[PDB]
């Protein structure tokens with residue numbers, strides 16, 4: 038796999054080049070816009086995923102399982118990244134900048150906004166860099182579904198092992214970026230841990246988003262398979 | 267004085283704080299019903315929770331927090347903590363979950379209690395991963411402490427609130443240093459050290475997922491008052 042031969046700088050360059058554009062917005066009127074926005078973002082996400090080194094080496098079925106598991110987390114991490122320089126607010130799009138009080142417009146929707154704002158403030162706290170962000174987003178794509186592959190074929194074992202090797206490459210990339218920026222080794226491993234522990238909170242926000250939502254709108258396995266073909 | 271500890275002092279503190287293995291209620295009616303399996307698991311969890319509170323109060327830095335913040339961390343983390351304990355106990359029992367020395371369940375017993383079998387499968391996958399990584403006890407206790415301090419930290423506008431979180435993050439940093447020191451003394455290169463750190467911390471995202479799905483399918487949940495009372499005593 039070409040992915041495993043990449044240096045840290047080449048991994049970063051690939052991921053930065055794959056970044057989707059920032060899209061614009063075009064009770065049920067709030068969901069209306071958010072749903073229309075997310076629907077358009079999903080098409081770009083599929084095409085971004087195909088450009089994450091290592092992803093297309095997987096079978097189509099495994100590519101869809103990973104996207105099925107990660108898509109809301111990926112949308113949320115993008116939102117939190119967009120929102121860092123707007124404290125107390127969430128920039129869903131350049132023309133859709135929302136404060137806490139506009140969260141309440143939907144029943145259980147403020148709990149999630151508060152958690153999203155706390156994630157943006159954490160990123161701001163830590164001075165998260167764009168090169169670190171793209172690494173974290175690709176970690177979400179590969180990691181979130183890797184522990185729920187249902188098969189036990191030789192192929193499934195080889196797919197899981199490939200995913201973990203690619204994840205190790207991204208870990209190496211994160212450490213290299215920190216080393217280049219002048220962090221000591223102790224600081225390097227401390228910051229890596231801080232960044233990966235935030236992914237647990239992003240999993241949590243995604244899960245709660247789903248729980249509240251369970252308005253047919255969660256992309257199915259078959260939809261993702263069609264979009265990825 | 268948690269931030270003054272060294273790695274060995276941190277490891278020893280955590281090792282020394284481990285709670286005991288508890289048994290399931292003896293000689294239940296077998297085969298189980300849905301209600302009786304849930305009853306056994308609830309009774310075991312309720313007894314484990316008391317010992318979890320004692321353990322938490324011995325995690326370096328935990329008791330420096332206010333009582334409110336201590337309860338908040340426990341409310342967020344308790345199921346994850348129980349589950350990582352289960353996964354650890356089950357490592358040497360492939361295909362089965364050792365809920366207690368006298369309660370070892372296979373997959374078909376997960377299929378009791380409707381939808382429970384999904385979390386069963388997820389829990390066995392985690393135990394298999396730990397076995398494949400050959401997770402060491404000293405690493406397990408570090409990971410369980412991270413769950414306690416991490417799971418609730420992001421869901422606390424005051425100076426004190428800000429001091430509280432900074433303290434939690436500095437302790438989390440010391441525990442990260444401890445994990446690296448343990449991997450370093452075991453002979454892993456720098457690259458292997460950071461890669462293994464990452465692999466372990468990413469599994470915690472899966473434990474979070476399993477904990478969330480448990481509640482969703484699911485009161486039996488420990489209340490804020492219950493947790494607070496236990497902490498003050």
Ligand SMILES: COc1ccc(N(C2CCCCC2)S(=O)(=O)[C@@H]2C[C@@H]3O[C@H]2C(c2ccc(O)cc2)=C3c2ccc(O)cc2)cc1
Nearest residue numbers: 071072075112113116143145146149246247249250254255
């Ligand atoms: C379809 O499964 C979903 C799961 C959760 C949510 N949610 C809410 C929970 C309570 C009930 C209303 C929705 S939620 O709050 O967890 C979710 C986060 C934010 O609000 C939401 C929303 C969204 C809305 C509609 C949609 O079809 C896709 C995403 C968002 C969004 C959209 C674009 C983006 O780039 C980043 C975030 C929305 C959709």
Ligand SMILES: COc1ccc(N(C2CCCCC2)S(=O)(=O)[C@H]2C[C@H]3O[C@@H]2C(c2ccc(O)cc2)=C3c2ccc(O)cc2)cc1
Nearest residue numbers: 307308311348352371375376381382385386480483484486
């Ligand atoms: C047989 O294979 C399994 C058994 C139980 C589960 N689970 C779910 C519970 C119902 C809805 C969906 C399933 S689960 O993994 O979410 C977890 C909850 C339930 O099972 C586990 C469990 C437990 C885990 C570790 C312990 O050391 C002690 C107890 C139980 C428990 C019951 C009542 C409580 O007050 C607290 C916990 C998963 C797999």
